[PDB]
Structures are given as structure tokens and as C-alpha cells.
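Slack export, channel: ligand-projects

TW: morning all. Re-posting the request from yesterday since it got buried. We need the structure predicted with the small molecule present, not the apo form. The ligand is copper (II) ion; the SMILES is in the block with the sequence. No rush, but it would help planning for next week.
GE: picking it up
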Amino acid sequence: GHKRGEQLFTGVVPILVELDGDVNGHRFSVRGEGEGDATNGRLTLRFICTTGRLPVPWPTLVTTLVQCFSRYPDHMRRHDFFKSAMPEGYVQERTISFRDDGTYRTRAVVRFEGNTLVNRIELRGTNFREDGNILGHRLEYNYNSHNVYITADRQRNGIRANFTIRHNVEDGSVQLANHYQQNTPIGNGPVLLPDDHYLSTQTALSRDPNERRDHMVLLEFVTAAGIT
Ligand SMILES: [Cu+2]
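GE: finished. pasting the full C-alpha cell output, ligand included:
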């Protein structure tokens, strides 16, 4: 499926993101729109909290809110699980453990709906501290560059990822977010299971000066590496 998979991402692909969340019993929705250019490893997305103010800091939702847009170098083309699963797509599930705070559990369907790459997500957040860095909104509106360490999950016919997000705190401390990820294909066709490698992920967060709703403008650059 990797040959057809590759061809689905050769140009600029429209993206739709839909997130329904419940954190410590606070319900919210995020809707995101933009485009991906896998050839350049580039994402541009605009996200709206459609339900009011986001009950958690925007930066905490970045990993949850489409790794099929990663730039896989030619010599790593056999290691691109994400594109090989398209168009039928994959289920992406995470546990995100915030050090000394609560936990997100996420389940996402990533697939083509017509010519649009859609990321449809459910998030449940539990056991957050009422006056922690997250519910207290003490995280800076910024984002560090990270390596996502990918390994094959042969039993699942998919992949696992492990990484720790470093969120800058307003007092100059760092809030760690331990990510446990598994991806499983939705389709029955063959997918590529990779040798161990990483995704070099860089994220720029900005604001739309014209937008009244709680929102996040995102630009992301992602390249696969760690295989010679
Ligand atoms: Cu294939």
C-alpha cells in the first residue's frame, strides 16, 4: 500500500482536525483546518476552541492535534508506516502522563475523507491538580523541538512511539509530559513496519490578531532520521 500511500502526499493536502475532550469533567471541542506538504515535512494549521476557552493550555494538545506529513528521506522510504496505511488510515492512541499531575488518554482516527486528511480525536484527562501548571494555565505559549522515537509493533502490525515533551513553565521550570503511543492500521492491505528511527519535530505556535475565539496557529516541520 506504500506506493499508493506515497502518491496521496506528493502535493499539498487539506487537513481537518476534530477533537472532543473531557478534562477533570470539563468538556471542550477543538476544530482545526489547514494543509500538509509531506514532500517538505510541513504542516500549517489553525485551531479554534469551539466551546469557549480551552480548559488546558494549548501547548498540551499539540501532540494530540498527523505524522503521515513527516518528510521521510528517499533512503528511509521503506520505514514510513504512516503513509503506507493510507487512504484507509490508522488508529493513533496515547497515554500522556504529566509529571506530578494528571493524564490524557487519546484515541484518534487518521484517514482520508475524499481528498482531505482527517484527524478525529477523543481525549479524556483525569486526576489533574486544580492549581497545577495545566489547570492553572502556567505553561508558556511556545514549544520545544523533540525527537519521536519510533519502533515496530509486529504483533499489532503497527508502531509504538515513546518521547517526553518539555513544556516551558512561566516561572522558568519545565513541565514534563511522558508520551506512550501506539498506531494500528484500519485497512487489511500491507503496511511498512519500520526499523527503529526518530521523527525530528519542530513546532512554531502563533496567534491570529483578527480572531476573537480561543485559538492556536501552528506551523510544524517534521523529518525522519536515525537510519543511514
Ligand atoms: Cu505498500
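GE: first-pass observations. Residues 163 and 179 are 5 Å apart (CA to CA). The chain has one domain: 2-225.
TW: perfect, thank you
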